[PDB]
Amino acid sequence: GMKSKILIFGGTGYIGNHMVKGSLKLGHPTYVFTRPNSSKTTLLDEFQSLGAIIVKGELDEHEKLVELMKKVDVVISALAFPQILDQFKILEAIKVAGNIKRFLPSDFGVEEDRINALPPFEALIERKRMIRRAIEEANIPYTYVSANCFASYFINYLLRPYDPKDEITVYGTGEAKFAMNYEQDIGLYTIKVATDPRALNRVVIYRPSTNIITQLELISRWEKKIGKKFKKIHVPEEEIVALTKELPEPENIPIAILHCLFIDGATMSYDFKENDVEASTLYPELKFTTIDELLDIFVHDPPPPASAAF
Ligand SMILES: NC(=O)c1ccc[n+]([C@@H]2O[C@H](COP(=O)([O-])OP(=O)(O)OC[C@H]3O[C@@H](n4cnc5c(N)ncnc54)[C@H](OP(=O)(O)O)[C@@H]3O)[C@@H](O)[C@H]2O)c1
């Protein structure tokens, strides 16, 4: 009816699929753009059964993008790091069509306009910054989502719950705080803020007070849940920094990211600004799945591990 029509790029993605599902669950007409040479016919078939409109095509098809933009109201990009600057193709189409009410570029991580990282990672987040600067210069309505850590992704990475090993690797001292959110919730909240006037042209941060923790605390709570103790093996900060300088690319990128999130504590190293919007405070009918609930999920029905593309 009056629900804004949402177009999602990278919808078959690791985080993108939760945005597609959240969109449909909220009653929004949902368009999913996907490459012709897909390996997700089963995933696309699921979206289709849920009401999604599938549009196959390449980002290089400028005319197709423009005609597609004219049919929707909101555009959300969940593309991967290798495709960050390819978002300029999306932006060009948005500018030509001229009817888009809100554009959310592919951020969904650290708040790159207030944090810095080691060269391997810094170079990549500068690409996201370039997208934001272009959006602002063109006066395109937007919302920048700092989702912080994808919870299933990093619980799997840090705890390797599917590994019966007796040791656990700790990065740095393990004392740095970080916030992590369940992917399913990042998906739903992103759709909500994309049409919330309170988020128009603002930075939105997902930092629920129940999802702030340190590596050491996460391990301790996990040990209690499963009744096992691990031998904590620390990897010195100086060691991690050296690796980012010697190891090749993309091998050194994940190392740089681990330093950013778990040693420097970039997701918790700042205080909110006047115009910042913390999403957990927005909807009284909704709440972010907490860390305790997340650990319970890994005990009962753990989601598969994942590895981002670099
Ligand atoms: N905060 C965190 O913890 C965290 C963790 C991981 C990722 N991220 C962020 O989340 C965002 C998305 O990451 P992701 O892991 O979800 O992405 P992804 O699943 O790797 O990729 C998303 C989609 O990109 C499309 N795609 C892939 N290669 C392409 C190409 N060459 N040309 C055009 N389209 C292509 C694919 O869709 P089709 O096959 O349908 O074309 C794919 O499903 C990024 O901004 C990333 O940095 C954050």
Residue numbers in the entry: 5 to 314
Excerpt from the publication:
Structurally, the PIP-family proteins organize around an N-terminal, Rossman-fold domain, containing a core, six-stranded parallel β-sheet flanked on each face by an α-helical layer. In summary, a mechanistic scheme emerges in which binding of the coniferyl acetate substrate within the active site of EGS leads to deprotonation of the p-hydroxy group (PUSH) coupled with expulsion of acetate ion from the C1 substituent (PULL).
A structure solution was obtained initially for the orthorhombic crystal form of holo-EGS, which contains two EGS/NADP+ complexes per asymmetric unit. A three-dimensional model was refined at 1.7-Å resolution resulting in crystallographic R-factors of 0.244 and 0.267 (working and FreeR, respectively). This refined structure then served as the search model for MR analysis of the monoclinic crystal form. The structures of EGS complexed with NADP+ or NADPH provide the first structural characterization of nicotinamide-cofactor binding by the PIP family of enzymes (previous crystallographic analyses had yielded only apo-enzyme structures). The cofactor is bound through a large number of polar and non-polar interactions. The adenine ring adopts the anti conformation and is sandwiched between the δ-guanido group of Arg39 and the carboxamide group of Gln87. The 2′-phosphate is sequestered by a short loop formed by residues 38–42, and is hydrogen bonded to the side chains of Thr38, Arg39 and Ser42. The nicotinamide ring adopts the anti conformation with its B-face stacked against the side chain of Phe154 and its A-face directed towards the substrate-binding pocket. The nicotinamide carboxamide group forms hydrogen bonds to three backbone atoms (ON7 to 154 N, and NN7 to 112 O and 152 O).
